[PDB]
């Protein structure tokens, strides 16, 4: 990669790929309400690239083969087992929560790298701020020991506080019973095992904590339930948004140089992900991890530097 100081000395600055379309728009919504429908609508209308939903195996998606690597490795999350039974003593709330946190952090870094590199701004759905609100309502249900929440508080304090928060946040409010009806419309039985008070506590924390703490960092527009498609109105509202507050007005160029040289090498981002605290619900001993690492070496397309990876090619190893 052609970076460091030398790109910043050949190329004059990096603020030249700005603005009025190079921006971060972010749709935050409740589950099965604020989704890729309105996100793809505003991304296709406004002239601005799109990111799909942050799944389980996003990290497997973004490198080489975008097939999901089998869930012995990317797990042991089992999101359908979370919608089935969030009460197991094997521990499947918080392992999944750490995994989705890392997934959201990686795709946020990929988005911010695509913004600061050439533009032209992106949409995100259910960002990291919605992720902590999501977990705090999951704790309001009481599936998790509070020490594990203290761990989450710790990881959240360390990682988020080096980034720039996004520009605009579109909150979608849908009431409970409509989301209930929609998850009945989809018909997936693991999804059909959801309970409603969990969803209610999501709406509770998602109104009561998220909105006071954004507060003109991530300027918001709050929309109603059938206020969806509805594309012209939200495109129009972004067209006359009048960006008022936020740290994005203070970079000027130097923080942007630090963010370009920080968001690249994503492993430098993730050097705070495993802290550790050792959280007996979470961690993994030596033996299982060692056999899983050796089986991860046994894959035909992941082993020893995907650039120079033989047994896909590449006939440039200088004989």
């Amino acid at each position: 990669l052609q970076y460091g100081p030398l790109a910043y000395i050949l190329g004059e600055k990096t603020t030249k790929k700005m603005t009025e379309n190079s921006k971060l728009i972010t749709v935050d919504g409740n589950i099965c309400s604020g989704k890729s429908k309105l996100a793809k609508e505003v991304a296709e209308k406004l002239g601005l690239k799109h990111f799909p939903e942050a799944g389980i195996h996003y990290a497997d998606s973004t490198t080489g083969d975008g097939k999901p690597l089998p869930v012995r490795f990317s797990g042991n999350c089992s999101l359908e087992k979370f919608y089935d039974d969030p009460k197991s003593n094997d521990g499947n709330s918080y392992r999944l929560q750490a995994w989705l946190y890392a997934s959201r952090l990686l795709q946020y870094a990929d988005a911010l790298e695509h913004l600061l590199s050439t533009g032209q701004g992106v949409v995100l759905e259910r960002s990291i701020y919605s992720d902590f609100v999501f977990l705090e309502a999951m704790y309001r249900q009481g599936f998790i020991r509070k020490q594990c929440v203290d761990h989450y508080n710790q990881v959240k304090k360390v990682t988020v506080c080096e980034y720039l928060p996004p520009h605009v946040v579109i909150y979608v409010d849908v009431p409970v019973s409509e989301v209930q009806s929609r998850i009945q419309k989809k018909g997936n039985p693991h999804e059909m095992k959801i309970t409603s008070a969990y969803l209610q506590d999501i709406e509770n924390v998602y109104k009561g904590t998220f909105l006071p703490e954004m507060s003109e960092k991530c300027e918001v527009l709050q929309y109603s339930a059938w206020e969806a498609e509805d594309a012209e109105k939200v495109v129009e509202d972004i067209q006359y948004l009048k960006y008022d507050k936020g740290p994005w007005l203070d970079q000027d160029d130097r923080k942007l140089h630090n963010l370009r040289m920080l968001v690249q090498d994503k492993l430098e981002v993730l050097n705070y992900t495993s802290i550790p605290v050792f959280l007996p619900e979470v961690t993994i001993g030596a033996h299982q991890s060692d056999r899983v690492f050796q089986e991860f070496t046994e894959l035909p397309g992941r082993k020893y530097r995907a650039g120079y990876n033989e047994d896909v090619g590449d006939k440039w190893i200088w004989l």
Binding site: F73, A102, L267, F278, T283, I284, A286, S289
Partner: protein, 347 residues
């Protein structure tokens, strides 16, 4: 920070240290130490956390007062026989003040209270650069002005720095504090043989600098502060483990390995004199400062601590830090044993 400004600050550190090496006037040496301080201050506080700010405060205070007490020693030298040639001094009192100024300068047993505190709250690059040039700048001066020093000064500070960097050192898992106490112990060794043969001191300076550069480069390859973070580096990658093994053992100084070679030559050209009990004391305390290296190795690569998933995530990204120059420094630093008669390459 600008990258142009960092190239400027590196230019001024190099200018200051080359001034200390090259000049023959006393005013110029004091200018060299001051400009070394002024340039090295904004390499620290490279981030803006208050840890770096308090660290830089402590460093500025002790460094600047060492600078001024050095100037007191020079003006004593002109109170007596007055000329500005870096030579034998002309007062035991002036030499006493001057070596106490340099002992405050490079870190030493009465004076070492700022070394772990200056290293703990700074990033790795700042710690590396301050160890390299802030141990390299005074050694030229002491190598010059050795022929007029009361010996008990140098030998006292050497012995006591070796045993302080020993005994202090069994207690920290903050890796910057471990490396700082390692710096204290090796600087005791390198101060010791100043009045016997300074070729050994300068060879030890080379070996120590290359070793600490290897160690800090390995920490910069994967940012760690505790030993448990090194156990996660075990799980994520295996070759870092055997490097931590080899470089920790060459900090330990075992005779198959290249870190033993500075101990051995010191004991040789020390014991050709009537000093035998002082070598066996020094080498017993050199046995002492291997123990925290050994528990550190037991943490990293030999036993294995339990890991965390999201290492499963970090498997999908192959490594992408640049090392400045790691492997060259490593096998320059560790397989160097059959080149002991590259001793006399130096004088």
């Amino acid at each position: 920070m600008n990258p142009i400004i960092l190239i400027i600050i590196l230019m001024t550190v190099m200018l200051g240290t080359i001034i200390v090496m090259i000049s023959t006037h006393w005013l110029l040496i004091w200018i060299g130490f001051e400009m070394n301080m002024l340039a090295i201050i904004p390499i620290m506080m490279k981030k803006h956390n208050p840890r770096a700010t308090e660290a830089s405060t402590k460093y500025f205070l002790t460094q600047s007062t060492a600078s001024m007490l050095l100037m007191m020693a020079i003006i004593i030298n002109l109170m007596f026989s007055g000329q500005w040639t870096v030579m034998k001094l002309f007062n035991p009192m002036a030499s006493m003040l001057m070596t106490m100024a340099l002992a405050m300068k490079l870190g030493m047993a009465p004076f070492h209270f700022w070394v772990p505190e200056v290293t703990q709250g700074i990033p790795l690059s700042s710690g590396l650069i301050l160890l390299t040039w802030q141990k390299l700048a005074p050694m030229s001066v002491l190598y010059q002005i050795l022929p007029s020093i009361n010996l008990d000064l140098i030998l006292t500070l050497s012995i006591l720095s070796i045993t302080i960097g020993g005994w202090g050192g069994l207690n920290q898992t903050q890796l910057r504090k471990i490396m700082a106490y390692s710096s204290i112990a090796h600087m005791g060794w390198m101060t010791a043989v100043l009045l016997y043969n300074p070729t050994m001191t300068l060879l030890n300076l080379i070996i120590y600098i290359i070793m600490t550069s290897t160690m800090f480069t390995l920490f910069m390859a994967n940012s760690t502060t505790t030993t448990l973070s090194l156990s996660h580096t075990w799980n994520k990658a295996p070759i870092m483990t055997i490097l931590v093994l080899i470089t920790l053992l060459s900090m330990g100084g075992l005779p198959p390995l290249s870190g033993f070679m500075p101990k051995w030559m010191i004991i040789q050209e020390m014991t050709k004199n009537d000093s035998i009990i002082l070598p066996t004391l020094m080498a017993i305390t050199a046995l002492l400062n291997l123990y925290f290296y050994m528990r550190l190795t037991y943490s990293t690569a030999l036993t294995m601590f339990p890991s965390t998933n999201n290492m499963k995530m970090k498997w999908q990204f192959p490594t992408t830090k640049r090392m400045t120059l790691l492997p060259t420094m490593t096998v320059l630093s560790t397989m160097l044993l059959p080149l002991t008669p590259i001793l006399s390459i130096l004088e």
